Structure 1
Amino acid sequence: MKRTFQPSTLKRARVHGFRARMATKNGRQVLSRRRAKGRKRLTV
Protein backbone atom coordinates (compact mmCIF):
# COMPACT_ATOMS: atom_id res chain seq x y z
CA MET A 1 0.00 0.00 0.00
CA LYS A 2 1.55 3.25 -1.15
CA ARG A 3 1.10 5.92 1.51
CA THR A 4 0.77 9.67 1.09
CA PHE A 5 4.27 10.64 2.26
CA GLN A 6 6.83 9.79 -0.45
CA PRO A 7 9.85 11.71 0.82
CA SER A 8 12.00 13.76 -1.52
CA THR A 9 14.25 16.33 0.15
CA LEU A 10 14.57 18.25 -3.12
CA LYS A 11 10.80 18.48 -3.49
CA ARG A 12 10.49 19.26 0.21
CA ALA A 13 12.98 22.11 -0.09
CA ARG A 14 11.45 23.59 -3.24
CA VAL A 15 7.92 23.55 -1.79
CA HIS A 16 8.45 24.43 1.89
CA GLY A 17 11.99 25.72 2.37
CA PHE A 18 13.22 29.08 3.49
CA ARG A 19 13.66 30.50 -0.01
CA ALA A 20 10.28 29.21 -1.15
CA ARG A 21 8.70 31.09 1.76
CA MET A 22 10.74 34.26 1.25
CA ALA A 23 9.81 34.37 -2.45
CA THR A 24 6.21 35.46 -1.82
CA LYS A 25 4.43 37.82 0.55
CA ASN A 26 2.23 35.16 2.15
CA GLY A 27 5.34 33.05 2.60
CA ARG A 28 7.04 35.91 4.41
CA GLN A 29 3.92 36.08 6.59
CA VAL A 30 4.41 32.45 7.61
CA LEU A 31 7.96 33.28 8.71
CA SER A 32 6.68 36.32 10.60
CA ARG A 33 4.01 34.21 12.29
CA ARG A 34 6.47 31.45 13.19
CA ARG A 35 9.01 33.95 14.48
CA ALA A 36 6.32 35.64 16.58
CA LYS A 37 5.28 32.30 18.10
CA GLY A 38 8.95 31.48 18.68
CA ARG A 39 9.24 28.26 16.68
CA LYS A 40 12.70 26.75 17.02
CA ARG A 41 12.38 25.33 13.51
CA LEU A 42 11.29 27.94 10.98
CA THR A 43 11.15 25.97 7.73
CA VAL A 44 11.56 22.46 6.33
Structure 2
Amino acid sequence: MKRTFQPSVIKRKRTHGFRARMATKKGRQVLARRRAKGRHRLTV
Protein backbone atom coordinates (compact mmCIF):
# COMPACT_ATOMS: atom_id res chain seq x y z
CA MET A 1 0.00 0.00 0.00
CA LYS A 2 1.67 3.13 -1.28
CA ARG A 3 -0.51 5.36 0.86
CA THR A 4 -1.67 8.85 -0.05
CA PHE A 5 1.19 10.62 1.76
CA GLN A 6 4.88 10.19 0.92
CA PRO A 7 7.12 12.87 2.39
CA SER A 8 9.82 14.72 0.43
CA VAL A 9 11.13 17.92 1.99
CA ILE A 10 12.35 19.39 -1.31
CA LYS A 11 8.92 19.13 -2.96
CA ARG A 12 7.20 20.24 0.25
CA LYS A 13 9.41 23.34 0.48
CA ARG A 14 8.95 24.24 -3.19
CA THR A 15 5.17 23.83 -3.06
CA HIS A 16 4.44 25.44 0.36
CA GLY A 17 7.53 27.61 0.81
CA PHE A 18 7.52 31.03 2.39
CA ARG A 19 9.30 32.31 -0.72
CA ALA A 20 6.79 30.60 -3.02
CA ARG A 21 3.97 32.23 -1.05
CA MET A 22 5.62 35.66 -1.34
CA ALA A 23 6.18 35.24 -5.07
CA THR A 24 2.44 35.17 -5.79
CA LYS A 25 0.30 38.07 -4.60
CA LYS A 26 -2.53 35.77 -3.53
CA GLY A 27 -0.24 33.69 -1.31
CA ARG A 28 0.75 36.81 0.60
CA GLN A 29 -2.96 37.07 1.44
CA VAL A 30 -2.88 33.52 2.83
CA LEU A 31 0.16 34.39 4.94
CA ALA A 32 -1.58 37.55 6.14
CA ARG A 33 -4.61 35.47 7.10
CA ARG A 34 -2.38 33.17 9.15
CA ARG A 35 -0.86 36.20 10.87
CA ALA A 36 -4.31 37.70 11.54
CA LYS A 37 -5.54 34.41 13.01
CA GLY A 38 -2.40 34.23 15.14
CA ARG A 39 -1.16 30.81 14.04
CA HIS A 40 2.41 30.17 15.20
CA ARG A 41 3.42 28.11 12.13
CA LEU A 42 2.89 30.31 9.08
CA THR A 43 4.54 27.87 6.65
CA VAL A 44 5.95 24.35 6.67
TM-score range, shorter chain: over 0.9
Q: Unaligned regions of 5+ residues in structure 2, if any?
A: none
**Which TM-score applies when normalising by structure 2?**
0.94
Kindly report structure 1 stretches of 4+ aligned residues shifted beyond 4 Å. Answer: none
Aligned length: 44
- Which residue of 2 is the match for residue 5 of structure 1? 5
Tell me, what secondary structure is at the counterpart of 2:6? coil
RMSD: 0.5
Residue identity over aligned pairs, in percent, reads 84
Tell me, what secondary structure is at the counterpart of 1:41? coil
- Which residue of 2 is the match for residue 18 of structure 1? 18
